[PDB]
Design a protein around this ligand. Structure first.
Ligand SMILES: *C/C=C(C)/C=C/C=C(C)/C=C/C1=C(C)CCCC1(C)C
Length: 137
């Protein structure tokens, strides 16, 4: 697998409904959906070590992990969590998250490299799955 690259979003589905389950009110949900249209992912993969930079027009954040090793990041609605990534297949990984403080919906994400050169990311809160599709810049 070579997830490394500069990825630009081409399609984003069910993001508003994800934010709804996480308790974001409607006006901010719409504003967030609009930001998701301009959002980019930079990945550097070496073996099973990943550096991921997620950026929008005004915000950037870095995620660093090695597959199978616990790390700390934040949920989609911004709460800190402990995360653990495992492979599901040659080109798909899955992340399970656990809140450090409090309760909330069960969240997770996945990344997949398709045979067509697309990157598919999903983010889940309970029953609702957001699917986002990227191509290399
Ligand atoms: C492997 C990829 C990961 C962990 C990507 C995570 C992406 C996000 C947490 C994106 C969040 C967004 C917002 C909370 C507001 C709207 C724009 C997004 C999609 C960048």
């Amino acid at each position: 697998p070579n997830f490394s690259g500069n990825w630009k979003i081409i399609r984003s589905e069910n993001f508003e409904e994800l934010l709804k389950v996480l308790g974001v009110n409607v006006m901010l949900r719409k504003i967030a959906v609009a930001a998701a249209s301009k959002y980019a992912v930079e990945i550097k993969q070496e073996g099973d070590t990943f550096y991921i930079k997620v950026s929008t027009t005004v915000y950037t954040t870095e995620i660093n992990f090695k597959v199978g090793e616990e790390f700390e990041e934040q949920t989609v609605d911004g709460r800190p969590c402990k995360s653990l990534v495992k492979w599901e297949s040659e080109n798909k990984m899955v992340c399970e998250q656990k809140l450090l403080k409090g309760e909330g919906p069960k969240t997770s994400w996945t990344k997949e490299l398709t045979n067509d050169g697309e990157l598919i990311q999903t983010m889940t809160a309970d029953d609702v799955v957001c699917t986002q599709v990227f191509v290399r810049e």
